[PDB]
């Protein structure tokens, strides 16, 4: 049978190579069982006439496919659109010998379209593999607004969220822009120092100029770009040591033609033995129909593999991506590029010389340039953090103890000293006690400097979703860590699942539970006087706290929680006084806070014992590089007996 295929090129010389390839592939099977022809057209400066010419090419024969290539024109985006749309009307399968834009993969918009070269989006897999190899976890992603940048970012975020790690910071600048120092300035003020670039050549050059002006291209940094950003005028001026990557043998335009014709022949041979010989559309006018077996031909073509291609084994992705093309790692060794390793998209094999980095050093850089000035946020809790006013001399009055050594103190700022009515006022105070001493030991153990301060609301911190919105932002101290106000939390913070979702803790240093305080029938949470509302006994807690979540996390206790929704304190030891004034019947709260005051002052008793047990722990931002050392210090403190000596000092000196 006479089987006909088509093609479109621009060489007028490699078209001879196309006809030679189709004849040589006809030498593989030529018993007339199927017989192959070949047609061709050239490109034109006008697009509408180009579409009409592809129309007339299509009518010329009973064509089974189309092969389109990139002409000497510099507008590489729209060049294969007039052939794809027109033929896309009749579901005629097409192939792309060389095109990299990531819009042709949207199968809902270009109905029938394939490829033999991976798009610009697939580089994210190579970047992820390199990150896994070199172990750089804190990354910064700088991208553009054009569809290609969004697609690349979406793929990289898909991988990172598949490992549930996320990105340190994502920031994008609109395309065709200049004098954009603001965004690099915004990205400069973080601990993560590896930045990943993807933009056009001119934008790459502009970013290079700005970054070189901002000193951010020297030592301590590593930033690796794609392939579109080390070509042309962008390659002219760039900092030394920029990692990159190039295709296996792309832009040959004649190596892929043999593979295209081979796979087309392999597909058409398998297609022709099917019952439905619809026979491709004939005519560009009047025929307002589709090809009756176009989808079937595309499906068989997709799942047809090749044995020995000049560019390697050929398979197709779910949309026609090249599926395991090679990749070559690059570098900038003093104004001249070089090959450093070959990665096949699954793994990277360094098969070349050593790689130099921007600072000229030879040892591998690590990200997260660790700061030394850390903010700290805490709350007013009696047994742990005492707040006091300072004197006029500038130092809070000294206070010796029976041991023979003084009590450590520090200066804590932040509040108005009057929560209910305060227009605007921040005052300096003094803080001391248990957690402050623990912070003293921690800081002296791991070489750092602290600047303590207090929260702006007074509540511990609890997730909530305000009305007229779909996003929920944490409130109070817990929010302060996420939004960037603080860096660490040295305070009695309990460890619940909801907190553990977005922050990460150290090992616990004090275990406890929840219990009840009563002024000297009251018992645990089983009595009908408690399960049901009655005026004889009234229970309450502190609003916007953990116990609120614990009592809203249980359907079968709804009514009881509702009771708590009626009235509760946004308070402190003030609640202990409200119990003292016979206003409140009983109190339910953490074990240590109640047990200290009960045995400390007078006339108050703890009811029964604990029922729900939990610990106390330091809070730190997600995957911060300090947690391991903090936990190793806490365990060492537990093993020494220092938390024992510290414990008697502050809690066992009572009764």
């Amino acid at each position: 049978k006479i089987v006909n295929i088509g093609a479109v090129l621009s060489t007028r010389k490699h078209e001879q190579m196309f006809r030679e390839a189709v004849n040589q592939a006809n030498k593989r099977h030529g018993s007339w069982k199927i017989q192959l022809n070949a047609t061709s057209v050239t490109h034109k400066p006008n697009a509408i006439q180009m579409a009409l010419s592809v129309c007339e090419d299509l009518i010329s024969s009973q064509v089974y496919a189309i092969l389109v290539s990139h002409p000497p024109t510099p507008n590489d985006h729209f060049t294969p659109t007039p052939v794809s749309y027109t033929a896309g009307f009749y579901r005629i399968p097409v192939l792309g010998l060389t095109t990299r834009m990531s819009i042709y993969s949207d199968k809902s918009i270009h109905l029938s379209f394939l490829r033999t070269v991976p798009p610009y989006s697939h580089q994210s897999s190579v970047w992820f593999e390199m990150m896994r190899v070199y172990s750089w976890n804190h990354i910064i992603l700088l991208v553009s607004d054009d569809h290609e940048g969004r697609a690349a970012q979406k793929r990289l975020e898909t991988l990172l969220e598949e490992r549930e790690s996320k990105a340190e910071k994502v920031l994008q600048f609109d395309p065709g822009t200049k004098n954009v120092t603001a965004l690099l300035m915004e990205a400069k003020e973080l601990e993560a120092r590896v930045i990943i670039l993807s933009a056009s050549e001119d934008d790459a050059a502009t970013v290079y100029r700005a970054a070189a002006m901002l000193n951010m291209t020297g030592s301590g940094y590593v930033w690796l770009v794609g392939e579109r950003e080390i070509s042309g005028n962008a390659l002219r001026y760039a900092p030394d040591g920029i990692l990159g990557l190039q295709l296996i043998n792309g832009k040959n335009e004649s190596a892929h033609i043999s593979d295209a014709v081979g796979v087309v022949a392999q597909a058409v041979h398998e297609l022709l033995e099917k019952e439905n010989i619809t026979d491709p559309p004939r005519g560009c006018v009047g025929n307002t129909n589709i090809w009756k077996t176009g989808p079937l031909f595309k499906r068989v073509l997709m799942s047809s593999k090749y044995a020995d291609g000049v560019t390697g084994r050929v398979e197709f992705n779910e949309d026609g991506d090249r599926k395991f093309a090679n990749y070559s790692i690059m570098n900038l060794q003093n104004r001249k590029l070089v090959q450093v390793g070959i990665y096949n998209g699954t793994h990277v094999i360094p098969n070349d010389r050593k790689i130099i980095w921007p600072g000229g050093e030879t040892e591998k850089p690590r990200g997260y340039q660790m700061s030394t000035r850390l903010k700290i946020v805490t709350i007013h809790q009696e047994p742990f953090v005492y707040v006091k006013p300072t004197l006029s001399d500038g130092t809070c009055k000294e206070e010796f103890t029976v041991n023979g050594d003084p009590v450590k103190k520090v200066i804590c700022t932040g509040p108005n000293d009057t929560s209910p009515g305060s227009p605007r006022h921040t005052v300096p105070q003094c803080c001391y006690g248990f957690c402050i001493d623990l912070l003293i030991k921690l800081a002296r153990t791991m070489n750092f400097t602290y600047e303590v301060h207090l929260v702006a609301d007074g509540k511990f911190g609890t997730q909530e979703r305000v009305n007229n919105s779909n996003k929920k932002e944490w409130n109070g101290m817990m929010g302060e860590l996420l939004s960037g106000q603080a860096d660490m939390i040295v305070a009695p913070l309990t460890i619940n699942n909801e907190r553990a979702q977005y922050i990460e803790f150290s090992k616990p240093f004090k275990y406890q539970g929840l219990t009840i305080l009563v002024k000297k029938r009251i018992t645990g949470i089983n009595d009908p006087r408690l399960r049901n509302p009655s005026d004889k006994f009234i229970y309450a807690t502190v609003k916007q706290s953990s116990v609120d979540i614990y009592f809203r996390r249980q359907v079968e206790l709804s009514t009881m929680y509702r009771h708590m929704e009626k009235h509760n304190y946004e308070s402190a030891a003030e609640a202990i006084q409200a119990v003292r004034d016979n206003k409140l019947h009983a109190f339910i709260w953490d074990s240590a806070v109640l047990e200290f005051e009960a045995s400390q002052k007078c006339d108050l008793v703890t009811t029964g014992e604990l029922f729900f047990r939990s610990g106390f722990g330091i809070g730190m931002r997600k995957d911060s590089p300090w947690k391991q050392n903090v936990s190793l210090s806490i365990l060492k403190s537990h093993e020494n007996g220092f938390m024992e000596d510290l414990d008697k000092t502050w809690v066992r000196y009572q009764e």
Partner: protein, 213 residues
């Protein structure tokens, strides 16, 4: 805010009647009170036909499909379930003359909206044979001024994405006459409904109960 506890999601492959066996088994072993399906009009005739064989069209179950299907709203086809719910933008009953009137009205409204600014009546591009129009001149205002313009008390705010944002849209269903009927509007983001209780018109499910204080 509601819990929205979902049972299963299934991806079928249904077309011409050659490969129509695996989808049968997949559709056989899934059960639910409510179904939300996504297919084209040339494929609902296969989906519902196979569903009517595995007991999924009785009054116990109820269906909801977007506006991509049911393309010929004038004459609904057979084998469709009685009483499936879909959503259609406003002016689904309008006449073709009314539609062209609305189009010319919105275009002229934008043109005269710029005219009140006394700037110009910009001329189009030249032709197709030159491949002209390299950059966007001060003509870019025109397109922008073609967005907010309303007409006859109908919000026609067009998004930067080329589709209108926040219109009024209605809900339709197939009564026991096989002709669509309006159910409830969506004016200003509050649902209206013509039926306080779903009719369930026409083994079985969905049994009614009674109780008193």
């Amino acid at each position: 805010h509601v819990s929205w506890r979902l049972l299963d999601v299934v991806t079928l492959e249904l077309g011409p009647g050659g490969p129509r066996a695996r989808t049968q088994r997949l559709l056989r072993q899934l059960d639910a009170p409510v179904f939300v399906a996504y297919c084209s009009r040339e494929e609902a005739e296969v989906l519902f036909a196979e569903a009517a064989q595995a007991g999924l069209v009785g009054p116990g179950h109820v269906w909801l499909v977007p506006n991509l299907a049911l393309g010929s709203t004038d004459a609904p086809p057979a084998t469709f379930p009685v009483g499936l719910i879909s959503v259609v933008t406003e002016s689904w009953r309008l006449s073709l003359r009314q539609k062209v009137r609305d189009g010319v009205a919105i275009l002229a409204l934008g043109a005269h909206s710029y005219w009140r600014q006394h700037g110009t009546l910009p001329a189009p591009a030249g032709d197709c044979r030159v491949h002209p129009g390299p950059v966007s001149p001060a003509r870019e205002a025109f397109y922008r001024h073609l967005l907010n313009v309303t007409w006859e008390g109908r919000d026609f705010s067009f998004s930067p994405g080329g589709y209108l944002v926040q219109p009024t849209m209605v809900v339709i269903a197939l009564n026991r006459h096989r002709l669509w009927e309006m159910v409830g509007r969506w004016e200003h983001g509050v649902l209206y409904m013509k039926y306080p209780v779903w009719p369930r018109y026409s083994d079985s499910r969905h049994l009614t109960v009674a109780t008193l204080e």
